[PDB]
Amino acid sequence: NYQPTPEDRFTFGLWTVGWQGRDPFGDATRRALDPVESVRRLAELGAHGVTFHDDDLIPFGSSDSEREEHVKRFRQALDDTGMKVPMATTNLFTHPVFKDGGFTANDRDVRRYALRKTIRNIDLAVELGAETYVAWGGREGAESGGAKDVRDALDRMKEAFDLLGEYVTSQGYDIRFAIEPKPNEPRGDILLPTVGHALAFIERLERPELYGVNPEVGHEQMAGLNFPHGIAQALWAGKLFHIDLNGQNGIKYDQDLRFGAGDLRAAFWLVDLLESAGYSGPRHFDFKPPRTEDFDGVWASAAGCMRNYLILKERAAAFRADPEVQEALRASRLDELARPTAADGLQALLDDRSAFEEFDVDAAAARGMAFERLDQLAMDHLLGARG
Amino acid sequence: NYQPTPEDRFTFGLWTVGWQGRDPFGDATRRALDPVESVRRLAELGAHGVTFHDDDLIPFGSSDSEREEHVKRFRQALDDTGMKVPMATTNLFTHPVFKDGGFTANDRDVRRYALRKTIRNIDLAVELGAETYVAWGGREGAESGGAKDVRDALDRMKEAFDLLGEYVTSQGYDIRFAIEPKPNEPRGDILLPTVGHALAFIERLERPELYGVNPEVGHEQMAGLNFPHGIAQALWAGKLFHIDLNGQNGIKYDQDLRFGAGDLRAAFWLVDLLESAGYSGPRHFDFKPPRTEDFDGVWASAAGCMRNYLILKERAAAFRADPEVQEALRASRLDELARPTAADGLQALLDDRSAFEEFDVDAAAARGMAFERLDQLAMDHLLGARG
Amino acid sequence: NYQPTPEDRFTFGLWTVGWQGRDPFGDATRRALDPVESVRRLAELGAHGVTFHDDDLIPFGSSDSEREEHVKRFRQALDDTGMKVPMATTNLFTHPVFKDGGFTANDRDVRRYALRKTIRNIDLAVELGAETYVAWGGREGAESGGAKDVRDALDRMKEAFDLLGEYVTSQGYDIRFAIEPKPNEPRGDILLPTVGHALAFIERLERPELYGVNPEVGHEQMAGLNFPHGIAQALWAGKLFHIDLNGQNGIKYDQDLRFGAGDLRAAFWLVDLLESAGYSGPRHFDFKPPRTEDFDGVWASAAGCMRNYLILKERAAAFRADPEVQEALRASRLDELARPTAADGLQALLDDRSAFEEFDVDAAAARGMAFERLDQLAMDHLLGARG
Amino acid sequence: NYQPTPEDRFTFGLWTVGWQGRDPFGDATRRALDPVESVRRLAELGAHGVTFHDDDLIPFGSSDSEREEHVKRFRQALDDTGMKVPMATTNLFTHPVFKDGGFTANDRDVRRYALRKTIRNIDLAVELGAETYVAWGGREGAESGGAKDVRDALDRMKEAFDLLGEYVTSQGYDIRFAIEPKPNEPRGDILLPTVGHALAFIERLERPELYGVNPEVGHEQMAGLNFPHGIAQALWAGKLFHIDLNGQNGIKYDQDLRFGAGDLRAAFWLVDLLESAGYSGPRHFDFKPPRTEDFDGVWASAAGCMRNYLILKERAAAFRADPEVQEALRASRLDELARPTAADGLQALLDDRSAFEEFDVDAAAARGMAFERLDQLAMDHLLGARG
Ligand SMILES: OC[C@H]1O[C@H](O)[C@H](O)[C@@H](O)[C@@H]1O
Ligand SMILES: OC[C@H]1O[C@H](O)[C@H](O)[C@@H](O)[C@@H]1O
Ligand SMILES: OC[C@H]1O[C@H](O)[C@H](O)[C@@H](O)[C@@H]1O
Ligand SMILES: OC[C@H]1O[C@H](O)[C@H](O)[C@@H](O)[C@@H]1O
Ligand SMILES: OC[C@H]1O[C@](O)(CO)[C@@H](O)[C@@H]1O
Ligand SMILES: OC[C@H]1O[C@](O)(CO)[C@@H](O)[C@@H]1O
Ligand SMILES: OC[C@H]1O[C@](O)(CO)[C@@H](O)[C@@H]1O
Ligand SMILES: OC[C@H]1O[C@](O)(CO)[C@@H](O)[C@@H]1O
Ligand SMILES: [Mn+2]
Ligand SMILES: [Mn+2]
Ligand SMILES: [Mn+2]
Ligand SMILES: [Mn+2]
Ligand SMILES: [Mn+2]
Ligand SMILES: [Mn+2]
Ligand SMILES: [Mn+2]
Ligand SMILES: [Mn+2]
Ligand SMILES: [Mn+2]
Ligand SMILES: [Mn+2]
Ligand SMILES: [Mn+2]
Ligand SMILES: [Mn+2]
Ligand SMILES: [Mn+2]
Ligand SMILES: [Mn+2]
Ligand SMILES: [Mn+2]
Ligand SMILES: [Mn+2]
Ligand SMILES: [Mn+2]
Ligand SMILES: [Mn+2]
Ligand SMILES: [Mn+2]
Ligand SMILES: [Mn+2]
């Protein structure tokens, strides 16, 4: 059971299963994969689609003709397997030129290079059918306080995204942008470090409707934040355009563990929220098979991502359908949370004596919330111990 | 030297110096302070004014007659000292009735009660001359995943703030609201956990121009975030309405140490920012003298907040005036960061071969940023090691 | 199913279910419990025993006769229910006198008071049949760097524990001490902040055999550390004398959530280790029912602690008995880890050419560890999805 | 002013200034440095000596003939400058063969290979005059719970260190070992994650007198720990054999910033401790110049490490010499902390009614500790704001 199919909309970046195992303290432990091989193996495991950085598909500094050849072989593998490409992105972080950023580099000529590199890949994305374009500003930030004027840096970030909006609009492309936050690493502090910050920024853009977030489980957990809560805020604002699923064990380096690993309960509440809210975008796994693994472990790890999603989905659906849970939800007044506080309006509220002058504060204070019994029903469902 | 004057705009909460020393593990170590005594002593140390929660000034459940007696004695002390009251705030966290929140309590009647409690104190704040009203949603949140539907809770949060805005608009009050974020404590996770999340939420209110943020140094540091970067983003958006200054030693419980303690470098960079940007609001200290101290230590800790601000103000000014610094700032191309990427416009950028096709990537990549030299000049100035 | 009985050796402190809900930002939400009532209710839920601080059982500053009466009523409740008292401890943290510590207070007269208070409760512990005496130095540390000379503080800590060792030895008591570490809260930094630190210290005591650790799940997670790993080190040294079980969501204030909540996977690996290693001490829950709950939630929360242990035990036993897991363990060379590296000795190792001169480094490097498949079998077992 | 001299005992790893700037997300930004060039440039900035991993000096897999050519050119540069080599260490982390560890790899042959690699470099270290040999078990650990039996792994760790001690004992070498802890990265969790855990482990080795710790400022701060407190415990136990000085901004990836950056107050307190205690070992910097820098920044960052040490040394001495400070230290009873609690012995303590029965608890509790005043005097000195 728990067999993935394309109806589940699971996607993987080429850089995930293709990660060669180079870390800051050591060399690669695995050979490079041909993207064609990755397309085929993922199709067989039941994936829906693949994603790419420009540089994962076309080696940096290729001629237009070697570019043509890379894209053509990839497009044939897609046609044979039926795999789609729902999202694309730019590598503005690997090459030494980007050591101080892409869009917010201090040097003007690098910022123009970064925009040109992005625009070129936008054209390619549209040609392969991508509807979301992700931007992760992994080099945008600083190690020291004086290096970056952050107000100037935000003006340059806004500038860049406005230009990109202008481009896609002027070409008639039906693509949207999704900003991916991360708090740190590889910079000491990265600009727009959380879902909140990225949401707030988007509202100051010229055409905010074109822009959303691509939150990553591990990145918000690197700041000690509740990921389902962040996601809920992004859903509430209409801005969850895409998601990166993985695992992370607390506040440390970015681990990119397979989804389900790391904080398992947060994974459950996340799946519950995504499925209850009707999120219909890709379930995209941004993970790295650890460098201990050979290729067989690479595929077992990828298979696990999808497996763990499906198991959590089944348990969250069981939880929500259980009439004992529905009863506990009423006992905890979750239904009362969904009622407006004051649809009667301001004047009626001020005139309502039972809301102040005659409010019996001690009787309300005495009501139990019954949250611990509810949470124990959730645990029982998660663990398959509802006996 | 470094003696505060009331022109420096230093303010303190009543709850700061009046903190009796009760923590989750121990009893009070100091007697309660009469607010009249706080006002007089703060004025003597050179403070500009004081702030209050409703419940600091009028004990919860006071008759109208006691209420007036407390306000009368408070006003006289204010009159006698020339102390201002620039900000006020509501206690929606101490009483058991607020155990599941104020504005986002699952029970509707509690939510209405929280609003009426808040409104009553807005009137009092205006009477005392407050220009800013802070909200800290310390109980708004959860310890478990099922206890709060976060989309509903944000609907209720928005409803509450929209109603408060309608109130102040209809009364003709010149007062603005500032939301104070915190990521956790006393809730497992608190809603709107950081500056970014609060700035994002504001943009969805009915009258966003009336709402800004009141960031607190230690609260952002409890999520491992860079406080000056956060403040820079609030400034960029035009929403820094008030600030809470204190100290914090990394990711742990909310310490509320005196300003200058904790992350000293971040304090330097924050002062540099506030002073460079021309922030003209209060320099409010939200700190607790440690429970090891007697009253003499209370006043020493308070004096130290002001003194460290003034020391850092002088060191930041010396840093910015230093000719070697101005040369380092040019060497690191901070002036280029302040200029547009592409004020020639999108079409010219796409036509510029020097931006992409003919950009000398290896040459740009070799250019050092000279950020370490700059940062050592800043260190030298902070430490008073220049000449 | 999953019904606890005394054979499971589950114990609870009086202060756990008796926690009244006072936190740093608010008042109690529940009435005090009579310890007699707690003994009876826990007995009915299937607990083995209870633990206490001196001050949980005998109000601070009681006369010898009111002391007699408290202890007598408690001893009758124990006799009626058959509940045991396997561990006792001292409150050296609540009373204002201990604001700078007990054993490491700067003031000498407080340190002597702290030792006298502890010794008196040791006698009581022995009389009620306790075999472990826990010390948690919650006030031992500092908020500022100059306040405490830490070498002096360690000399005073050693002094105190040596005196206590001398006492129990001279009385012929068969009780052992267990040091409980915590990294911070309510002090900025607490002395002996982790399991490691406490282990290292114990080796410098006059009679190290009398002393062990009482590690708490949430406390090691407050420093971002792996709790099963810490426990394994404590087991390896022969020093795991007792354990505090609960849950915690990462690096923040001490949450004391019910066991199973917080990091669920770490809970599974913990149970696996305790049951595999044959740990035979109490399974003691140090948790606080959240302040949202009434008394019914208090008992549901306590019941959950034991339930979640039993469910995890069943899944870890299933995991270990699965011949497919046993195969995966061999594939990952866990059996090879248990073989000595060089039982042939130093000279034989230096003379072994296949270990260096002829070691084929590239062939060894190419071996996969197969850890991801093993971990996925663990996840499957935990979630009850081995289909 | 603040010019280092070789008498200040400042040392640097070859890998520090030679770090090429390759991080997990980007390519090298600087060319490799010839170790001869590092030695000469460091000597010019006033360094005392250098340290090396085997693989820094002799590339992995070098013939014996290349090995000798590299050592010969290195020795000549050492001779020419007067530079010492006080410490050496083994790279058991970069090559794929060490992907599951060196001493604790699940495969036995890898463990034997790690030992032989280490032994070969101990000989070379002794030849160059090293008195300390550091071990950093960067690969010793796990990403998942089942992958490592931690009791077995510690048996293997002990075996490895015991063998190294037998080696040095049998050769007659005057060299000591120092274990360098780190909590995580590049492993999910690393074994012996903190100073405490390493100190504890040492006591279980066959010849513990030969083993001490090499703590690193940023590594302890990655667990949110107080570095000066950790150093104080190592000193107390007589085990501070070497130290790594650098900077770190809280709980995240290992930043290895220049010393003085990061937590500046903790740096002040650390210098105060080292200088007060008379630590006579090397002041070793384990830092990486950020990848934004060119070679001129490399040397600036290195010079800055030394300079910040010397500035803080002067400020700590001024603090300790200040008469107002000595008075504050008496007011806070630091002198009483240095004296015994009960040098009258256990029987006298139990007989002393002033210690318990007749102790005036309310009077002792009212005494302020005066820690804030003390700490503001320390702030004033660090900032150079005293007179
Ligand atoms: O979208 C860009 C992607 O770029 C990189 O691979 C980042 O590490 C990953 O977090 C992100 O999702
Ligand atoms: O403004 C409201 C204030 O309420 C409480 O005292 C908080 O702990 C504090 O951080 C906040 O600034
Ligand atoms: O043993 C003493 C006990 O004291 C307190 O209740 C602590 O909060 C708890 O962590 C500890 O287990
Ligand atoms: O001594 C061994 C050294 O090895 C590596 O370079 C580590 O990253 C470092 O922290 C350590 O000090
Ligand atoms: O409890 C009083 C009840 O009345 C309401 O305020 C409105 O129906 C409920 O939300 C609350 O739970
Ligand atoms: O010292 C002040 C700080 O100390 C604590 O009591 C310890 O938990 C906090 O609640 C408070 O903010
Ligand atoms: O793999 C070579 C094998 O030979 C051993 O070193 C000894 O049996 C094993 O531990 C290793 O896995
Ligand atoms: O700037 C130096 C630091 O930068 C990083 O590359 C970013 O991940 C770390 O690996 C390194 O220690
Ligand atoms: Mn299906
Ligand atoms: Mn699919
Ligand atoms: Mn940048
Ligand atoms: Mn990631
Ligand atoms: Mn990602
Ligand atoms: Mn009164
Ligand atoms: Mn007057
Ligand atoms: Mn928004
Ligand atoms: Mn605070
Ligand atoms: Mn505040
Ligand atoms: Mn049973
Ligand atoms: Mn039991
Ligand atoms: Mn102490
Ligand atoms: Mn705890
Ligand atoms: Mn405990
Ligand atoms: Mn060579
Ligand atoms: Mn010579
Ligand atoms: Mn030990
Ligand atoms: Mn490091
Ligand atoms: Mn190091």
mmCIF file of N, CA, C and O in Angstrom, chain C residues 176-195:
data_model
loop_
_atom_site.group_PDB
_atom_site.id
_atom_site.type_symbol
_atom_site.label_atom_id
_atom_site.label_comp_id
_atom_site.label_asym_id
_atom_site.label_seq_id
_atom_site.Cartn_x
_atom_site.Cartn_y
_atom_site.Cartn_z
ATOM 1 N N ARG C 176 21.266 6.860 46.714
ATOM 2 C CA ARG C 176 22.219 7.398 45.791
ATOM 3 C C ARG C 176 21.728 8.714 45.291
ATOM 4 O O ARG C 176 20.540 8.966 45.265
ATOM 5 N N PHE C 177 22.662 9.524 44.813
ATOM 6 C CA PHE C 177 22.323 10.851 44.324
ATOM 7 C C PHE C 177 22.282 10.885 42.791
ATOM 8 O O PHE C 177 23.125 10.302 42.133
ATOM 9 N N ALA C 178 21.360 11.656 42.242
ATOM 10 C CA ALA C 178 21.313 11.835 40.795
ATOM 11 C C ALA C 178 21.214 13.348 40.499
ATOM 12 O O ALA C 178 20.266 14.030 40.938
ATOM 13 N N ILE C 179 22.226 13.855 39.795
ATOM 14 C CA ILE C 179 22.284 15.265 39.353
ATOM 15 C C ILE C 179 21.462 15.467 38.076
ATOM 16 O O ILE C 179 21.708 14.807 37.032
ATOM 17 N N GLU C 180 20.551 16.444 38.116
ATOM 18 C CA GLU C 180 19.719 16.753 36.969
ATOM 19 C C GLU C 180 20.191 18.045 36.250
ATOM 20 O O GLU C 180 20.211 19.146 36.873
ATOM 21 N N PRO C 181 20.670 17.907 34.994
ATOM 22 C CA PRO C 181 21.207 19.105 34.368
ATOM 23 C C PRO C 181 20.071 19.884 33.679
ATOM 24 O O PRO C 181 19.062 19.310 33.363
ATOM 25 N N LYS C 182 20.323 21.156 33.420
ATOM 26 C CA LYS C 182 19.484 22.020 32.599
ATOM 27 C C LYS C 182 20.414 23.145 32.138
ATOM 28 O O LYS C 182 21.195 23.620 32.933
ATOM 29 N N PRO C 183 20.321 23.579 30.879
ATOM 30 C CA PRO C 183 21.268 24.589 30.409
ATOM 31 C C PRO C 183 21.020 26.017 30.842
ATOM 32 O O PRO C 183 21.971 26.809 30.991
ATOM 33 N N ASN C 184 19.765 26.369 31.010
ATOM 34 C CA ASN C 184 19.359 27.697 31.390
ATOM 35 C C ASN C 184 17.921 27.624 31.942
ATOM 36 O O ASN C 184 17.232 26.624 31.711
ATOM 37 N N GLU C 185 17.462 28.759 32.495
ATOM 38 C CA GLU C 185 16.134 28.995 32.988
ATOM 39 C C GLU C 185 15.890 28.252 34.311
ATOM 40 O O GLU C 185 15.745 26.972 34.334
ATOM 41 N N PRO C 186 15.750 29.027 35.400
ATOM 42 C CA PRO C 186 15.554 30.449 35.428
ATOM 43 C C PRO C 186 16.810 31.369 35.481
ATOM 44 O O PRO C 186 16.677 32.590 35.399
ATOM 45 N N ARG C 187 17.998 30.840 35.630
ATOM 46 C CA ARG C 187 19.212 31.612 35.418
ATOM 47 C C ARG C 187 19.619 31.729 33.916
ATOM 48 O O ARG C 187 19.360 30.861 33.117
ATOM 49 N N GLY C 188 20.363 32.770 33.577
ATOM 50 C CA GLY C 188 20.803 32.996 32.191
ATOM 51 C C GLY C 188 21.600 31.823 31.660
ATOM 52 O O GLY C 188 21.383 31.414 30.506
ATOM 53 N N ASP C 189 22.438 31.251 32.536
ATOM 54 C CA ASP C 189 23.176 30.021 32.276
ATOM 55 C C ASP C 189 23.246 29.285 33.592
ATOM 56 O O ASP C 189 23.523 29.897 34.638
ATOM 57 N N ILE C 190 22.952 27.988 33.569
ATOM 58 C CA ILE C 190 22.946 27.195 34.789
ATOM 59 C C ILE C 190 24.285 26.403 34.752
ATOM 60 O O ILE C 190 24.719 25.988 33.667
ATOM 61 N N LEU C 191 24.901 26.214 35.928
ATOM 62 C CA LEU C 191 26.129 25.375 36.037
ATOM 63 C C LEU C 191 25.789 23.852 35.819
ATOM 64 O O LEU C 191 24.672 23.436 36.146
ATOM 65 N N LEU C 192 26.701 23.125 35.190
ATOM 66 C CA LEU C 192 26.494 21.717 34.772
ATOM 67 C C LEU C 192 25.315 21.632 33.790
ATOM 68 O O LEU C 192 24.288 21.028 34.085
ATOM 69 N N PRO C 193 25.470 22.233 32.606
ATOM 70 C CA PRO C 193 24.235 22.547 31.839
ATOM 71 C C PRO C 193 23.755 21.380 31.044
ATOM 72 O O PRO C 193 22.647 21.452 30.535
ATOM 73 N N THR C 194 24.565 20.291 30.942
ATOM 74 C CA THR C 194 24.156 19.147 30.168
ATOM 75 C C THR C 194 24.605 17.868 30.872
ATOM 76 O O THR C 194 25.433 17.921 31.772
ATOM 77 N N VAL C 195 24.094 16.751 30.382
ATOM 78 C CA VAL C 195 24.500 15.417 30.803
ATOM 79 C C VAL C 195 25.998 15.218 30.827
ATOM 80 O O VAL C 195 26.508 14.672 31.806
#
